[PDB]
Design a protein around this nucleic acid. Sequence first.
RNA 1: AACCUACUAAAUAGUGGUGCUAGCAUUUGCUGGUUAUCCACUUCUUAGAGGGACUAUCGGUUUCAAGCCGAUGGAAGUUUGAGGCAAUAACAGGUCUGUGAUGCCCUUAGACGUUCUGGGCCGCACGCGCGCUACACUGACGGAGCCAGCGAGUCUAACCUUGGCCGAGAGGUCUUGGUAAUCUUGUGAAACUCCGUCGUGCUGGGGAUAGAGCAUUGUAAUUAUUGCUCUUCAACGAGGAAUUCCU
Lengths: 60, 141, 168, 53, 143, 70, 206, 55, 145
Amino acid sequence: GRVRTKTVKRASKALIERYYPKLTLDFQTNKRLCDEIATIQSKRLRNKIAGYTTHLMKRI
Amino acid sequence: AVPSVQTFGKKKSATAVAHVKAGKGLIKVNGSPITLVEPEILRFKVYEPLLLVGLDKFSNIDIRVRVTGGGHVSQVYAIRQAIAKGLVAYHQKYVDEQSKNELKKAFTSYDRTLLIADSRRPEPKKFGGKGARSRFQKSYR
Amino acid sequence: ALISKKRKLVADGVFYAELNEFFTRELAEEGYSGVEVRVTPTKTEVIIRATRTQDVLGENGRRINELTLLVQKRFKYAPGTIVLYAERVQDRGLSAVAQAESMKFKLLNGLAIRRAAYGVVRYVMESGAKGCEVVVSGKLRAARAKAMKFADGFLIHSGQPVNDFIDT
Amino acid sequence: ENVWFSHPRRYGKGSRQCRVCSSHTGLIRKYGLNICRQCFREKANDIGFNKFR
Amino acid sequence: PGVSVRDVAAQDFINAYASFLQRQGKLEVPGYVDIVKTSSGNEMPPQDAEGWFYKRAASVARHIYMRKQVGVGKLNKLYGGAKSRGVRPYKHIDASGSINRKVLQALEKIGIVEISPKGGRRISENGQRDLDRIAAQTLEEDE
Amino acid sequence: AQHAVILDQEKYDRILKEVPTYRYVSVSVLVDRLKIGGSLARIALRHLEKEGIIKPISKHSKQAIYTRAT
Amino acid sequence: FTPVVLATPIPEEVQQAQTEIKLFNKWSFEEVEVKDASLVDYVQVRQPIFVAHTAGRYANKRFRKAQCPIIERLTNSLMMNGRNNGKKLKAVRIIKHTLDIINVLTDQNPIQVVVDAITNTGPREDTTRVGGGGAARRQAVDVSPLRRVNQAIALLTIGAREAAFRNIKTIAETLAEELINAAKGSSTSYAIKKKDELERVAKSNR
Amino acid sequence: TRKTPNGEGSKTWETYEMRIHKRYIDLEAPVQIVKRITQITIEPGVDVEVVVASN
Amino acid sequence: SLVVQEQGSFQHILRLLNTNVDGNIKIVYALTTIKGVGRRYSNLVCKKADVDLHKRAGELTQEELERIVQIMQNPTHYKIPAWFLNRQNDITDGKDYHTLANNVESKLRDDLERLKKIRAHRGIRHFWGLRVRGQHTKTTGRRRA
RNA sequence: AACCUACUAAAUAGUGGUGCUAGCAUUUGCUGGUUAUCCACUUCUUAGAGGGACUAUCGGUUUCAAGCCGAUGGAAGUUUGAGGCAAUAACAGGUCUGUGAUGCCCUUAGACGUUCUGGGCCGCACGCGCGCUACACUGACGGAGCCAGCGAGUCUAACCUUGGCCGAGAGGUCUUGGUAAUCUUGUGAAACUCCGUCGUGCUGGGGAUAGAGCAUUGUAAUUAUUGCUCUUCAACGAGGAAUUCCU
Ligand SMILES: [Mg+2]
Ligand SMILES: [Mg+2]
Ligand SMILES: [Mg+2]
Ligand SMILES: [Mg+2]
Ligand SMILES: [Mg+2]
Ligand SMILES: [Mg+2]
Ligand SMILES: [Mg+2]
Ligand SMILES: [Mg+2]
Ligand SMILES: [Mg+2]
Ligand SMILES: [Mg+2]
Ligand SMILES: [Mg+2]
Ligand SMILES: [Mg+2]
Ligand SMILES: [Mg+2]
Ligand SMILES: [Mg+2]
Ligand SMILES: [Mg+2]
C-alpha cells in the first residue's frame, strides 16, 4: 500500500499552493527546497512530501 | 610499488576480499589455484568470469582472493563476484574507461550478480514457531 | 573490584533499582520523585530529587544523616565514600511520580474520587502540560470492581514520542 | 548451638532466590543480576533494559 | 617450477603421502591399530585395517603444514563426526585424543612436526621439505 | 540370498561374451542382467577396464557409465 | 582456438571449450529448438549456462518462474521429498549423470531430449471441480503454457522418484529412463500415462 | 522472557536488550595534565578508567 | 579388486556353535547372526584371525574357521582388551567372559534369576514384566507384552 | 538487517611494503613462519557523523483521480524485508503458587508457621496432545575435504578453558590465556562435498528393550542424572477417517 497519508498530501498541497515559483519537476531540488523551506522532523517524511510535491507539480 | 587494486564479494555473510596487482598472471584463492576451490560442481561458477571476458585479460595482472564466513555456496559466490568486481576495478583505474564498460557490458549481459552484491538475508525467527514464518502446531482439542 | 563490564553495568542498574525502591518507600510523605547517582573519584554521590527538602534535611542536619548511614551500611561504603544531596524539583506538575503519590495522598486523606482525579488533572494541566491522564482501577465501597479514566488536553499513545514525551 | 535447623544450600533452585521477593521460581540468573522474571520486567526500565526490537 | 602442497589437490596428495608412508615402512603404529574406533561418535573402526594410520598421519601433516600451530584437542574436533545417539538427535562430538596425539608423536619422531612454542604442533623443516617434495611428485604423476 | 554373490566360471565368460550392444553398463545394468551382486558387479566394472570393451566416460561412486569399444 | 596460459595453469579442453562455445557442462546449446509451438518463452535454452546452479530471484514476481533455465528447473524440482530439501549439489550431479546417460542412449543433444520430454508431457487440458449444484461435475479447461511446463516437470520427477525408490537403479538411471521414454510418448513411463489419462478424463466430461 | 506472570495464554515472548558501548583512547602526557584532565570532564554514567604501564 | 574363479571349494551355509550361518555373504557380517557376536566383536576377531575380509563367509578354509571359533571363546588369551567383552568381572568368580551363542540366553536368565532370587527392585520389576531402567510407563508401551 | 574505494580512525580490527626466516623452483617467482624490527594505508572489520528511496524515469491501466500494472534504473521498489510501540471499550479469560501488592474468610503451638529424616509428583490395563527417531541406495557405513553466525564466560573465586602427556572411549592429570573484539575461538558445528564398502534381502536400514563393565556431577544416583564399551537386534516395508504450518 503506497498511499500517502493525509499529512503528506496536505503539506504538498500548501507548498504548491504558495511556492510555485521555485519547485520544478525535480525531486532533489524540491527536496533541498523542503529542507530550507520546511520544518519536517525526518528525512523519510520530507522525501515523502517532496516526491509528492513532485508528482502534483508534474501533472499540473 | 606496482599498479594494484582491491575489491570484495559478499553473499549471505561470506566476504571474499580480492587483491589485483600488476602481475605475471596468477589466479590463486586463499593460497591455492583456482583449479581447485571445489565444490567442484560449482567449479565453472568461479571459472565463469574468466571465460566471459577472455583468459588473456589476466596475463598482465596478479589475482589473490581470501574468503571468510558464510558456508560453501556462500563463499563460492563471494569469490567469483570479488574477482569480477576486481577485473573491472583495475580497468577502472589503470587501462581505459571504454575497456571498463566493455567488461561491465560483457559481464552483466550474462552475469549472475557478478558486479552487484546480492542483498538477500536471513529473516529473524519470531516466537510462536521454529522458523521465521513457520508457526508452531495447534490441535484445537 | 574486578568484575566484567557486563556484570558491572547490569549491577549498576540493579543498584539504582533497589535505590529508587528504598527511597520510594521511605520519602513518600515528601513527594520524593527520583534519584541520580554521581560516581566520582574520592566520593560516590547520590541526589534525592524530592519536592520537600526541609523535612528530608531534618533538625540541624539529621534524617539525611540517617538516610546516608542507612544506605551506607547496606552497600557497605566507608563513612565518607558516599554522599547524599537533597534537591527540590522543578514544578512537581510535570512528574508522573509526584502526582500519583499525591492522588494516593488525596484518597488516603479521605476525598471524593472525582475531586481528587479532576483537581490533579487541573493542576498538572495548569503547570504547562500538553495533556494529562488518570486511571483509577479497584473498588470503592461498591462490591463489584470498577475503573475510571480521566484524560484532558492532548497526548499521544504510540510510537517513539512515548520515549520522548509521556511520563507513566 | 542448635545443630538441627539447616542442611545443604549450595546449588540447585533452593540455594538462591530473588533479591527483591525471595522467590526461587522463575529466576533469571544471567549477568549476575539474580532477579525473577516476574520482578525483572517491573524493574527492567529502572535497571537498564529497554524495548527496541 | 616451484611447488607447494597447496598447489596439489587434497585427495591425491594425501593418498600419495599415505602410499609413501607405506612404502617408507618407518612409522610407529602404536599397536592398538585395527582394534580401535577413532571416535565415540563413530560406529565401526576404519575399513582400511592395515593402514589408515598412514592416512590420518598425512591428514594431520597436511593440515598442520597449512597453518600456524594446532594441538591435540584441535584435531579431535576436526576429525569429529556427528554422533547418532540412536533415538535422540545427532550432535557433534570430538574424536580420540589417543589417536591424534600418537600421530603427532609418531610423526614428531619421524621428524615432520615439532612441539611448537606458544603451544601445539608446528610444521617441521624436514616436513615442509618432504611434503613439498611429494607434492611435486604428485604433480609429476599428471605431466 | 537370491543368488549372485559368487563367480560360477560359466558366468565370467558370460560377462565376456555379453557386453557388446551395451550402450550403458553400470552397477544397475549388470544387476538387471540377472546376475552379479552389487559388491562383485563393481569388480566387473573395474576389471572390464583392464583392457577394451568399456570406455570410461563417467566418474565415480554410486554412478558409473561405460560404452562399448570403438 | 588460440591457446593461452599465464601462471596458474588452465587445462586444455577447459580453455578450449569455455572461451569458444559457451556450451553446457560439456553440451551444445546451439541448435535445439522447442519441438512444439507455445512452450517457447516458457522453455529456456539461450542464454546458456555452465552448471545448473543459479542464485536467481525467480520468486519475487509472478511470471519470473519463466525465464529460468529449463534444465535447472529440472534440478530444482529434484531436490525435495522432504529429506532432500535443499541439497542442490546432490541433484545437480545426478542431473549431470542423467545427461550423460541420455547422451549414451540413442545419441541426441540430451538437453534437447529433456525438451522432448517436457513438451511431450504437458497436458493440453484437464478437469476442474465445478459446483453445478453440490454434485461437482468436471469441466474440461485448456491449461496455460506455464502450468503445462510445471506439471510435466513435477510429474516427471515424481514418477521417477517412485522408480528409483526401493530398487537397484539410482535417481539418474530412472530419471534418464523417464526423460528417454517420455522424449516421445512411449506410455512405458509415468508422465505419458498421467498426461494421456488427464486428457482422457478431460475429453470424458465435455 | 514470557510476557505473562503465570503460564496461561498464547505464548508471548519478549526480548529485552541493553546496549553497552566501550571505547578507549590512548594519550602520551605527563602527570600534571592527566590529573588535571581526569579530575574534571566528570560524567555520571560514563565509566572512566585510566590505566598506565607498557606491560 | 579383482575377479576370481574358484571351483567347488566353498560350500554355502555352515554351522558353528550350534547356529547356522548363510554362506555367500560378507564373512565380517556372517558371524553376526550368532548370539553374543556383533559387528565390532566379529571384526576384531576376523582381524585377529589373520583372515581376509574381502573374502566371503562361503570361502574361508576350515583352518580359518576353527581359528575363528577358537579366538572368540578364548578372548584375553589371543589378546583382546578385556573391556572389549560383554561379561567382564562375572559376578562370582570375577573372570572376564564373553558369553556366546546359545549361552547368552542362559546368562540373561542366570542374571535375571539372580535378581529375583535377591528380591531387589530390578528383579521385582523383571518379574512384574515392566521396564527397569527407570523409564516412564504412563504413556509408552501399549501392545508391549 | 541491507548500500557508502566519500568523512574522522583503530597492536583488542585488518591491508600492502619491509627487513629476520622455512620450503619448492631456480630466471625474476610461488607458499608460509615473525603481538613491536620498522614504514604506509583503512578496500575487508569495527561504531561515530552524515548521505541514500520519494515506489523515481519512461510507459500502460483506471472516472487519465487516488492508485495499480510493465519495463529501465538501482544496494534496495510485497508497508524496502524483520520486528518495538500502539487508541476506545469489552471477558466476571488467567494470576492471591512472583511479590513485605492486597480486602475479607480460615488456621496460629498435637500449626495450615517453620525446619530436620525418608518417600512422592516419574507411580501404569488405557484415552487425548507437542514432539524426537525411523522404515533406507537423493542411503547407512568408513576414510578424506572442511565452511557459519547469534551468545557466555572466575572476587573477595573455581566460570569459559587452549596446551603437554596418560587412557579405546568416556575421562584423568600437569600447566596456561581471559572480568574479554585481546583468551576459550576462526567456536575447524552439522547436514553438505569427495574416494570407497555394502546391494535390496525387516539387509550392514532402524535402535526400542535388555545384561555386564568403566567413568563423570553431587552429601546422596536404588525407582537405574548423564557420559562411554561390548553384547541383546523389537515395532516400523510411507501410514484409515481426519488434520497442523507455510509464499
Ligand atoms: Mg501520532
Ligand atoms: Mg506505528
Ligand atoms: Mg536455614
Ligand atoms: Mg520467582
Ligand atoms: Mg570426519
Ligand atoms: Mg550377534
Ligand atoms: Mg570503510
Ligand atoms: Mg534490475
Ligand atoms: Mg472465571
Ligand atoms: Mg492472601
Ligand atoms: Mg500451609
Ligand atoms: Mg510434572
Ligand atoms: Mg545402524
Ligand atoms: Mg559421510
Ligand atoms: Mg535387520
